[PDB]
Design an enzyme around this catalytic site. Structure first.
Site, PDB file in Angstrom:
ATOM      1  N   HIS A 154      -9.284   3.471  -5.383  1.00 19.67           N
ATOM      2  CA  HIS A 154     -10.806   3.581  -5.541  1.00 19.67           C
ATOM      3  C   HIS A 154     -11.264   4.056  -6.831  1.00 19.67           C
ATOM      4  O   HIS A 154     -12.358   3.556  -7.339  1.00 19.67           O
ATOM      5  CB  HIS A 154     -11.501   4.494  -4.340  1.00 19.67           C
ATOM      6  CG  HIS A 154     -11.543   3.714  -2.916  1.00 19.67           C
ATOM      7  ND1 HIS A 154     -12.848   4.282  -2.434  1.00 19.67           N
ATOM      8  CD2 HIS A 154     -11.023   2.720  -2.491  1.00 19.67           C
ATOM      9  CE1 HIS A 154     -12.777   3.428  -1.092  1.00 19.67           C
ATOM     10  NE2 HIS A 154     -11.767   2.503  -1.141  1.00 19.67           N
ATOM     11  N   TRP A 192      -2.579  -1.094  10.600  1.00 17.79           N
ATOM     12  CA  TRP A 192      -2.143  -2.485  10.276  1.00 17.79           C
ATOM     13  C   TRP A 192      -0.728  -2.730  10.967  1.00 17.79           C
ATOM     14  O   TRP A 192      -0.266  -3.874  11.028  1.00 17.79           O
ATOM     15  CB  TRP A 192      -1.939  -2.526   8.783  1.00 17.79           C
ATOM     16  CG  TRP A 192      -3.334  -2.906   8.177  1.00 17.79           C
ATOM     17  CD1 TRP A 192      -4.128  -3.779   8.054  1.00 17.79           C
ATOM     18  CD2 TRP A 192      -4.253  -1.642   7.545  1.00 17.79           C
ATOM     19  NE1 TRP A 192      -5.402  -3.682   7.136  1.00 17.79           N
ATOM     20  CE2 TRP A 192      -5.524  -2.202   6.928  1.00 17.79           C
ATOM     21  CE3 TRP A 192      -3.786  -0.373   7.274  1.00 17.79           C
ATOM     22  CZ2 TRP A 192      -6.379  -1.827   6.282  1.00 17.79           C
ATOM     23  CZ3 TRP A 192      -4.793   0.393   6.563  1.00 17.79           C
ATOM     24  CH2 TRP A 192      -6.112  -0.258   6.295  1.00 17.79           C
TER      25      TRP A 192
HETATM   26  C1  HEM Z   1     -10.167  -6.675  -0.646  1.00 16.83           C
HETATM   27  C2  HEM Z   1      -9.631  -5.621  -1.058  1.00 16.83           C
HETATM   28  C3  HEM Z   1      -9.616  -4.422  -0.075  1.00 16.83           C
HETATM   29  C4  HEM Z   1     -10.451  -3.879   0.901  1.00 16.83           C
HETATM   30  C5  HEM Z   1     -11.601  -4.688   1.499  1.00 16.83           C
HETATM   31  C6  HEM Z   1     -10.092  -2.770   1.543  1.00 16.83           C
HETATM   32  C7  HEM Z   1     -10.770  -2.235   2.756  1.00 16.83           C
HETATM   33  C8  HEM Z   1     -10.150  -1.048   3.227  1.00 16.83           C
HETATM   34  C9  HEM Z   1     -10.946  -0.138   4.362  1.00 16.83           C
HETATM   35  C10 HEM Z   1     -12.026  -0.678   5.075  1.00 16.83           C
HETATM   36  C11 HEM Z   1      -9.909   0.697   4.588  1.00 16.83           C
HETATM   37  C12 HEM Z   1     -10.105   1.872   5.654  1.00 16.83           C
HETATM   38  C13 HEM Z   1     -11.158   3.165   5.207  1.00 16.83           C
HETATM   39  C14 HEM Z   1     -11.169   4.002   6.282  1.00 16.83           C
HETATM   40  O1  HEM Z   1     -11.852   3.905   7.411  1.00 16.83           O
HETATM   41  O2  HEM Z   1     -10.589   5.373   6.150  1.00 16.83           O
HETATM   42  C15 HEM Z   1      -8.983   0.875   3.682  1.00 16.83           C
HETATM   43  C16 HEM Z   1      -7.698   1.525   3.932  1.00 16.83           C
HETATM   44  C17 HEM Z   1      -6.744   1.603   3.059  1.00 16.83           C
HETATM   45  N1  HEM Z   1      -6.583   1.046   1.735  1.00 16.83           N
HETATM   46 FE1  HEM Z   1      -7.782  -0.942   1.631  1.00 16.83          FE
HETATM   47  N2  HEM Z   1      -8.871  -2.240   0.913  1.00 16.83           N
HETATM   48  C18 HEM Z   1      -8.771  -3.503   0.004  1.00 16.83           C
HETATM   49  C19 HEM Z   1      -7.638  -3.156  -0.916  1.00 16.83           C
HETATM   50  C20 HEM Z   1      -6.667  -2.030  -1.000  1.00 16.83           C
HETATM   51  C21 HEM Z   1      -5.714  -2.092  -2.064  1.00 16.83           C
HETATM   52  C22 HEM Z   1      -5.748  -3.044  -3.549  1.00 16.83           C
HETATM   53  C23 HEM Z   1      -4.874  -0.714  -2.059  1.00 16.83           C
HETATM   54  C24 HEM Z   1      -3.977  -0.273  -2.775  1.00 16.83           C
HETATM   55  C25 HEM Z   1      -2.991  -0.851  -3.582  1.00 16.83           C
HETATM   56  C26 HEM Z   1      -5.487  -0.282  -0.629  1.00 16.83           C
HETATM   57  C27 HEM Z   1      -5.209   0.778  -0.172  1.00 16.83           C
HETATM   58  C28 HEM Z   1      -5.699   1.385   1.212  1.00 16.83           C
HETATM   59  C29 HEM Z   1      -4.994   2.214   1.961  1.00 16.83           C
HETATM   60  C30 HEM Z   1      -3.801   2.904   1.521  1.00 16.83           C
HETATM   61  C31 HEM Z   1      -5.614   2.424   2.781  1.00 16.83           C
HETATM   62  C32 HEM Z   1      -5.719   3.573   4.210  1.00 16.83           C
HETATM   63  C33 HEM Z   1      -6.173   4.882   3.946  1.00 16.83           C
HETATM   64  C34 HEM Z   1      -6.027   5.865   4.905  1.00 16.83           C
HETATM   65  O3  HEM Z   1      -5.160   5.580   6.024  1.00 16.83           O
HETATM   66  O4  HEM Z   1      -6.992   6.756   5.029  1.00 16.83           O
HETATM   67  N3  HEM Z   1      -6.469  -1.134  -0.143  1.00 16.83           N
HETATM   68  N4  HEM Z   1      -8.961  -0.442   2.999  1.00 16.83           N
END
Ligand code: HEM
Length: 291
Positions: A49, A188
């Site tokens: 982020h 996931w």
């Molecule tokens: C289209 C690009 C992406 C979208 C739309 C997206 C969207 C999201 C959303 C909606 C969440 C859940 C947030 C929550 O409710 O706590 C999430 C979690 C997460 N994202 Fe993605 N993300 C994207 C790309 C990435 C990338 C590039 C990474 C790292 C390389 C990443 C790593 C993570 C991780 C590790 C979580 C889990 C966080 C947790 O458990 O608190 N995401 N993402």
């Protein structure tokens, strides 16, 4: 803008290795977070982020400035839930006050991945805190309710090609969505605090059903109790994306190699490294140090 990396005065590898170890020992200890997932996944999300705001067009945003520290960036609707990663790192920052923010946030992501048994990610120091006015406006992070076209376009602003986009998305093996933060709910996969190619397998192997959640957003749900965002699912709708997904589902090694490169790139976008700058550091894990 030009953002030149400037090493924290008189610090070397050993200094950074100590910050890494402090983060790592705290990950190990604060294991109850989010129902025993631990803080690993939130740290990875935090590093993405703060880096993901970069705009290759004018060189604004990215990890360099540690701007997430400012209210504007901190209160980004897209950053909801990250304050937890923030609070996790504060105490560390207090212990190693000489490290810049950008360097701490980025290192947190690296540490999390390596301690969750992922690949080694080379990391460079030198991010320098910038003033609150260099803080990027909200709305630079991606939406989840879109398609492959959107994803490709988006990533292009960060200079990422197809391969890099798919590699990076495999980070979705970690953690889970939280209704309250994002309007999405569920993990996931099953091993959500171990870095593996699980995401690609789930994607190919589950029987996904489109449904609306309680926030009234659509998500793909599997009978195993897993979920996929529209953007995740789009990786199998795009022919180019699908072939890479397949490769990764088939070879974890390949995935690890690609991820490592892509992740480092993401974290270094927008930064100029002088030729006298130290090469990237490869930190040892706790286990490798016997700690
Ligand atoms: C289209 C690009 C992406 C979208 C739309 C997206 C969207 C999201 C959303 C909606 C969440 C859940 C947030 C929550 O409710 O706590 C999430 C979690 C997460 N994202 Fe993605 N993300 C994207 C790309 C990435 C990338 C590039 C990474 C790292 C390389 C990443 C790593 C993570 C991780 C590790 C979580 C889990 C966080 C947790 O458990 O608190 N995401 N993402």
């Amino acid at each position: 803008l030009v953002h030149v990396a400037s090493v924290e005065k008189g610090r070397s590898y050993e200094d950074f290795q100590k910050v890494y170890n402090a983060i790592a020992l705290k990950l190990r200890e604060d294991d109850e977070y989010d129902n025993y997932i631990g803080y690993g996944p939130v740290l990875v999300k935090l590093a993405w982020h703060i880096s993901g705001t970069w705009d290759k067009h004018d060189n604004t945003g990215g990890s360099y400035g540690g701007t997430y520290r400012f209210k504007k960036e901190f209160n980004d609707p897209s950053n909801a839930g990250l304050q937890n990663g923030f609070k996790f790192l504060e105490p560390i920052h207090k212990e190693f006050p000489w490290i810049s923010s950008g360097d701490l946030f980025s290192l947190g992501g690296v540490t999390a991945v390596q301690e969750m048994q992922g690949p080694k990610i080379p990391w460079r120091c030198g991010r320098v805190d910038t003033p609150e006015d260099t803080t990027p406006d909200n709305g630079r992070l991606p939406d989840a309710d879109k398609d492959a076209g959107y994803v490709r376009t988006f990533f292009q602003r960060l200079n990422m090609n197809d391969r890099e986009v798919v590699a990076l998305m495999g980070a979705h093996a970690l953690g889970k969505t939280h209704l309250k933060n994002s309007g999405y709910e569920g993990p996931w996969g099953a091993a959500n605090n171990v870095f593996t190619n699980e995401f690609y397998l789930n994607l190919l192997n589950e029987d996904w059903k489109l449904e609306k959640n309680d926030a009234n957003n659509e998500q793909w749900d599997s009978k195993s109790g897993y979920m996929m965002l529209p953007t995740d699912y789009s990786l199998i709708q795009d022919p180019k994306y699908l072939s890479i997904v397949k490769e990764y589902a088939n070879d974890q090694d390949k995935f690890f190699k690609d991820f490592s490169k892509a992740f480092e790139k993401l974290l270094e976008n927008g930064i100029t490294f002088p030729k006298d700058a130290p090469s990237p550091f490869i930190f040892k894990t706790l286990e490798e140090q016997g700690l």
